[PDB]
Write a protein that binds this DNA or RNA. Structure first.
Ligand SMILES: [Mg+2]
Ligand SMILES: [Mg+2]
Ligand SMILES: [Mg+2]
Ligand SMILES: [Mg+2]
Ligand SMILES: [Mg+2]
Ligand SMILES: [Mg+2]
Ligand SMILES: [Mg+2]
Ligand SMILES: [Mg+2]
Ligand SMILES: [Mg+2]
Ligand SMILES: [Mg+2]
Ligand SMILES: [Mg+2]
Ligand SMILES: [Mg+2]
Ligand SMILES: [Mg+2]
Ligand SMILES: [Mg+2]
Ligand SMILES: [Mg+2]
Ligand SMILES: [Mg+2]
Ligand SMILES: [Mg+2]
Ligand SMILES: [Mg+2]
Ligand SMILES: [Mg+2]
Ligand SMILES: [Mg+2]
Ligand SMILES: [Mg+2]
Ligand SMILES: [Mg+2]
Lengths: 88, 129, 218
RNA sequence: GUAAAGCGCACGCAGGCGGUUUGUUAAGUCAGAUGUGAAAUCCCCGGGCUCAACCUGGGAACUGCAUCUGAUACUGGCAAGCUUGAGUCUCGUAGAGGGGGGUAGAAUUCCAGGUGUAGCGGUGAAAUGCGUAGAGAUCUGGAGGAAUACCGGUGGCGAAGGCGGCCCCCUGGACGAAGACUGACGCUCAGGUGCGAAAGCGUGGGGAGCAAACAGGAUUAGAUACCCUGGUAGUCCACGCCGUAAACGAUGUCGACUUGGAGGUUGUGCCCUUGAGGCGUGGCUUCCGGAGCUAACGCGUUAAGUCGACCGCCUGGGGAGUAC
RNA sequence: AUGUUCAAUAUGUUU
């Protein structure tokens, strides 16, 4: 999901430019947008275990990228987590 | 997930010698080039190349004496799960001296005989019999 | 180069992967053999034949398929050598001890058929004896007057006659065999990559070996 | 793999391991030295008991430890890179992948009605059983539940369990071509967490068919079995619990390398597409088989071959995977 | 169609 327009908007909002789409901030922002989105899908489809497996893969991917960003540059890490609404 | 490229180089040599391939190409590296230099000077391998700049490839020409491989048994000793460093007096003797034991010393990578000649030991990379 | 014949290409996808350096670039699901590697090894085989026939030779010719049989017969008898133009009896060389006795029985049957008593016995026994002589000639005709053991085995189909190859290997008798694309080129001491199905190609091979062994006969 | 032994499957913290280049450090590592490592003992060369045991002289060793000075190949730390790992984006493809909702047809059963009549049903043979109160058979109408013939395929998807009528809604993953993008962000994982067939448990519905238990009829020496006639939980649905299977390719995950053949499926590039063809290049997958391996059977590029990382497990058969 | 069971034991060589 997370249609081309929404993901390109996140790319432009969170990256160097629209071509810069693989940077850690953009990857984390896209995973976070997808997770906030899918929270509604799993609000009622509680028994969608096969899709929640991919959701948890997204959560773990976002956490691994956040750890990388933290131990790579703490300033960008703090900026991204506060701009994205993270830490529990 | 590629956690010992030195062992991968060794097993590439072994598989190529078992499959009677004349050449064996691998992702090159400075340590791999050192070990290949050691093998080429000690006679277990023919000439080699390090061709490539942004992604260098190491091309080793393997040796066959009659119809059999020259590299009899090339065994990795100091694998990244158990490192093996030996003193000068503790350096091994592969095939009772007529095989080599590539060891990394402070003066660069050299064979067991060379490390003993120079009076220092190091990390036993591999046994080439 | 294409010196002569049609031995330039043979068997399809059934190729032995060990016959790689001689397959030239198969065109339409048919593996063409590299003549640039065929001709020098063929002249090497012929040179070793010259050398071993200089030693007065004992050169078996093993062709058992329905193509190579008569050409093998003609070539061997034309020069002076011994041949196997039918099914290779398991143990002709390695079990030479008991096949020498069947050869002796064959020669006894033959001398009796010439100047003996195959006529002055029962007609049924006699027909049985001439049929047994027929079997013994059909099988051991070429090895009939073959002294002791051979000195080289010119095998035509390494895949079809691989019992003779394996039987010469454990005696150390050298093997000069025509190794098709689908064959195992290991027991052959001097391989000759070529075609087997073509009667004309096999006749080329047999004329070559006959001429060269006749040369070596000094 | 089958001898005991791969967790049911994955996620993942501590942990272990870690692509490539340069610089720096010198922790590991290595070299030398200093101190020490009691003596005896052990060992070596002697020497004294007539020999020997024994005693003893001198060494050697005490394979260790900390400190000092050096090397910087490798490992480690820091700094900076790099892209071949790993990810992100654009387009597209296939799919019983999942969750929710709605319909379709066939058929079973029941009910109401019509025709019609003495059988039906079942078996090895029968009988129980249903039937003149009219069954069975046949037609019409209605109800209700469950599963989706054909397609259907050693086909596909999924981490495993598992998932097949059609349609819609929400959603996960995989793969392919071309590019850009971040730049080692990776592999594994004790504990932990989640998913986990069937049976089973709880509450509430539902209940056509099938059917543990049960009842009857047979078989039988007996028959609390197989067989027959019925038949209740259950099978169905919602939400909870269990957490186990011959949860099995009896084969942990990840990565690299090493002859081939015939397929299946899903992509893709080009050429004569001068058709549905030929020639390549990817993903998944079925069978045969080479080297090699194996006790053998067999595995055999999807290895049980050659290696690396991490984990789990095994230690004679019972007792017992029981007891506490 | 169905159709049950059977207690435990010897062996032997050269130029
Ligand atoms: Mg077992
Ligand atoms: Mg398993
Ligand atoms: Mg960890
Ligand atoms: Mg490294
Ligand atoms: Mg140090
Ligand atoms: Mg002492
Ligand atoms: Mg004395
Ligand atoms: Mg001392
Ligand atoms: Mg360093
Ligand atoms: Mg370093
Ligand atoms: Mg860059
Ligand atoms: Mg665990
Ligand atoms: Mg549960
Ligand atoms: Mg159940
Ligand atoms: Mg229930
Ligand atoms: Mg029943
Ligand atoms: Mg279990
Ligand atoms: Mg199963
Ligand atoms: Mg198991
Ligand atoms: Mg096989
Ligand atoms: Mg228990
Ligand atoms: Mg009894």
């Amino acid at each position: 999901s997370l249609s081309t327009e929404a993901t390109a908007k996140i790319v432009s909002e969170f990256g160097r430019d629209a071509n810069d789409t693989g940077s850690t901030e953009v990857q984390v922002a896209l995973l976070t947008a997808q997770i906030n989105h899918l929270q509604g899908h799993f609000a009622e489809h509680k028994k969608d275990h096969h899709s929640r497996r991919g959701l948890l893969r997204m959560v773990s991917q976002r956490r691994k990228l956040l750890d990388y960003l933290k131990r790579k540059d703490v300033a960008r890490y703090t900026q991204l987590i506060e701009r994205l609404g993270l830490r529990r | 997930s590629m956690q010992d490229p030195i062992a991968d180089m060794l097993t590439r040599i072994r598989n190529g010698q078992a499959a009677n391939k004349a050449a064996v190409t691998m992702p090159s590296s400075k340590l791999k080039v050192a070990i290949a230099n050691v093998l080429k000077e000690e006679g277990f391998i023919e000439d080699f190349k390090v061709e490539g700049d942004t992604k260098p490839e190491l091309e080793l020409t393997l040796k066959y004496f009659q119809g059999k491989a020259v590299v009899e048994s090339i065994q990795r000793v100091s694998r990244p799960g158990l490192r093996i460093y030996k003193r000068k007096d503790e350096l091994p003797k592969v095939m009772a001296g007529l095989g080599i034991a590539v060891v990394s010393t402070s003066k660069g990578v050299m064979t067991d005989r060379a490390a003993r000649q120079a009076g220092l030991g190091g990390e036993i990379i591999c046994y080439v019999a | 180069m294409l010196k002569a014949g049609v031995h330039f290409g043979h068997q399809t996808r059934y190729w032995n992967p060990k016959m790689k350096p001689f397959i030239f670039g198969a065109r339409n699901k048919v593996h063409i053999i590299n003549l640039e590697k065929t001709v020098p090894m063929f002249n090497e085989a012929l040179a070793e034949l010259n050398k071993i026939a200089s030693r007065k030779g004992k050169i078996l010719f093993v062709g058992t398929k329905r193509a190579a049989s008569e050409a093998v017969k003609d070539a061997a008898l034309s020069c002076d050598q011994f041949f196997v133009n039918h099914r290779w009896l398991g143990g002709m060389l390695t079990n030479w001890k008991t096949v020498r006795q069947s050869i002796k029985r064959l020669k006894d049957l033959e001398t009796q058929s010439q100047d003996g008593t195959f006529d002055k016995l029962t007609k049924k026994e006699a027909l049985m004896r001439t049929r047994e002589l027929e079997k013994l000639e059909n099988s051991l005709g070429g090895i009939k007057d073959m002294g002791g053991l051979p000195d080289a085995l010119f095998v035509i189909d390494a895949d079809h006659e691989h019992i003779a190859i394996k039987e010469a290997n454990n005696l150390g008798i050298p093997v000069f065999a025509i190794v098709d694309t689908n064959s195992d080129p290991d027991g052959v001491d001097f391989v000759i990559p070529g075609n087997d199905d073509a009667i004309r190609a096999v006749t080329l091979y047999l004329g070559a070996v006959a001429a060269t062994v006749r040369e070596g006969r000094s």
